[PDB]
């Protein structure tokens, strides 16, 4: 079938985190990594950190003015988690991500 392969595998979940090199971010990072790595699943997530001090231009693009902060780009809809509540929002947002349910009402 496909490239002779029977399926285009889903693209790993694109997850990122904006930090200011502050321990808290590295702190929350562990929490983020720990939680994400806690859901494993057949679809692993890719955690990439963005140094706001290195590129504050994209931060403003996402109106992202608070740090630390986390932002999911996909697959699926985009979301912005910030306010040291990333772990609270993430844990709550994660399920919604996997539940990628017709976010419909």
């Amino acid at each position: 079938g496909s490239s002779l392969s029977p399926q285009a595998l889903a693209q790993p979940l694109l997850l990122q985190l904006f930090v200011d090199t502050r321990p808290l971010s590295q702190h929350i990072v562990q929490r983020v990594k720990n939680i994400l790595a806690a859901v494993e699943a057949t679809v692993p997530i890719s955690l990439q950190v963005i140094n706001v001090a290195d590129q504050p231009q994209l931060v403003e693009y996402y109106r992202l003015v608070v740090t630390p902060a986390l932002v999911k780009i996909g697959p699926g809809s985009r979301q912005v988690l910030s306010g040291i509540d990333l772990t609270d929002q993430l844990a709550n947002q994660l399920p919604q991500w996997l539940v990628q349910q017709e976010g419909i009402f």
Side-chain angles (χ1 to χ4, degrees):
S2 331
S3 110
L4 201 235
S5 327
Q7 224 26 359
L9 47 141
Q11 321 241 148
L13 191 179
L14 300 206
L15 195 295
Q16 280 171 205
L17 182 76
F18 283 87
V19 311
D20 64 309
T21 78
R22 72 198 277 160
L24 187 82
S25 8
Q26 312 247 319
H27 212 327
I28 289 171
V29 169
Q30 292 314 41
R31 290 191 203 212
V32 173
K33 288 192 193 236
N34 294 312
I35 299 172
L36 294 181
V39 68
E40 283 195 24
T42 61
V43 279
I45 305 97
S46 180
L47 210 205
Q48 264 196 330
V49 189
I50 309 195
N51 277 64
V52 302
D54 289 307
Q55 69 237 282
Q57 175 179 342
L58 59 58
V59 178
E60 290 185 292
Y61 182 80
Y62 298 112
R63 306 214 222 174
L64 200 296
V65 206
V66 295
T67 52
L70 198 161
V71 188
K72 185 235 229 199
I73 30 274
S77 160
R78 199 201 21 169
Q79 306 193 251
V80 181
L81 310 174
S82 170
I84 74 174
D85 67 356
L86 307 115
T87 62
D88 288 3
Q89 228 176 159
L90 177 61
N92 280 347
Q93 286 305 305
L94 169 51
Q96 301 183 343
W97 304 352
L98 300 180
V99 171
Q100 288 203 347
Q101 290 208 324
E102 299 353 333
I104 281 9
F105 18 62

